[PDB]
């Protein structure tokens, strides 16, 4: 009775970190279910929708005699770090980068998820060297994808392992989401009529004999093309804004120019309102 | 006997090195020892 009420009274007094029926479920009920290769349960590989490449998971619960110690499940082993400084020219890439960097188990888990995510991103985008080599010259060697719409600036945002114009944050999220978007478009269930198991747009071919244009627009390209168009639009908008703002400086005594941009700018589409706005007068808006 | 012994994550793949290892006493004849000075 003493051995029962002394070695099993851990959770009866206060819920603390204990792999025995108290910690393994928290991550399980949140991430996966019971699985056993040897002692491995529920590897995070996005294989539910990945269909790109398989990777196992070295996971095994363990205990330790200490204070406030969890199971500490083990774990790619790398990390990602994105920083954008794309304005340069070089004959050959291959050098190093500028590396400058709580539920510890969950931290390791999310780090592995992120490293697998960026690995899959780079695997998908890497499949763009062999393609229609026209109107888009591009080179790729190792984690770098250099491209140039026209010789004005650099490209190839990238990352690396660990162990001014703010064009840094909103350049990665788009290409990141592109993968799950490609997953979605080729996965929300069809349910077209009863269960032919197809696509809604594909099934809609019957009701209307769409033109060859719409037939082609049923599918579309992705990857390199999208990022290239995005970068072109961005640098072009930047140059246009620069020219407009410099026009005022270059001509001050001349009638100045007011600037007005839209409040809703699409991915590819956008609009800018510009008026003459003669100085000290409002009846000259012709 | 618990912390570590030989190697935890000691994955094959390039174990292929093994494969070549299977070349070397062959590329060159081990010399006799019989001397535990």
């Amino acid at each position: 009775a003493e051995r029962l009420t002394k070695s099993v009274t851990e959770n009866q007094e206060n819920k603390l970190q204990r792999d025995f029926n108290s910690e393994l479920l928290r991550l399980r009920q949140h991430w996966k279910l019971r699985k056993v290769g040897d002692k491995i349960l529920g590897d995070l590989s996005y294989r539910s929708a990945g269909s790109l490449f398989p990777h196992h998971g070295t996971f095994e619960v363990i205990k330790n005699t200490d204070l406030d110690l969890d199971k500490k499940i083990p774990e790619l082993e790398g990390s990602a770090y994105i920083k954008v400084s794309i304005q340069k020219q070089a004959p050959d890439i291959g050098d190093l980068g500028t590396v400058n960097l709580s539920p510890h188990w969950q931290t390791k888990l999310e780090a592995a998820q992120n490293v697998l995510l960026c690995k899959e991103i780079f695997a998908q985008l890497s499949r763009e060297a062999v393609q229609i080599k026209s109107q888009v010259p591009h080179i790729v060697v190792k984690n770098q994808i250099i491209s140039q719409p026209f010789p004005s600036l650099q490209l190839s945002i990238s990352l690396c392992h660990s162990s001014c114009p703010e064009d840094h944050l909103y350049v990665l999220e788009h290409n990141l989401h592109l993968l799950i978007r490609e997953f979605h478009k080729q996965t929300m269930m069809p349910h077209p009529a009863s269960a032919p198991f197809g696509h809604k747009r594909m099934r809609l071919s019957g009701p209307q004999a769409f033109d060859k244009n719409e037939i082609n627009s049923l599918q579309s390209s992705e990857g390199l093309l999208e990022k290239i168009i995005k970068q072109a639009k961005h640098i072009f908008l930047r140059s246009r804004a620069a020219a407009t703002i410099d026009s005022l400086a270059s001509r001050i005594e001349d009638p100045q120019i007011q600037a007005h941009w839209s409040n809703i700018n699409d991915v590819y589409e956008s609009s800018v309102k510009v008026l003459i706005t003669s100085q000290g007068y409002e009846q000259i808006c012709k | 006997k618990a912390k570590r012994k030989e190697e935890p994550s000691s994955i094959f793949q390039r174990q292929r090195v093994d494969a070549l290892l299977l070349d070397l006493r062959q590329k060159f004849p081990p010399k006799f020892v019989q001397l535990k000075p």
């Binding site: 040897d38 070295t58 | 030989e6 000691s10 094959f12 290892l21 081990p30 020892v33």
Partner: peptide, 24 residues
């Protein structure tokens, strides 16, 4: 190790490695 280190025989190859942890 010290002892006598008279491990002659032959072989001198094998592998002595382990990483079986990926459903294989």
């Amino acid at each position: 190790y010290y002892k006598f280190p008279k491990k002659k025989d032959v072989e001198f190859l094998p592998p002595q490695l382990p990483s079986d942890k990926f459903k294989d």
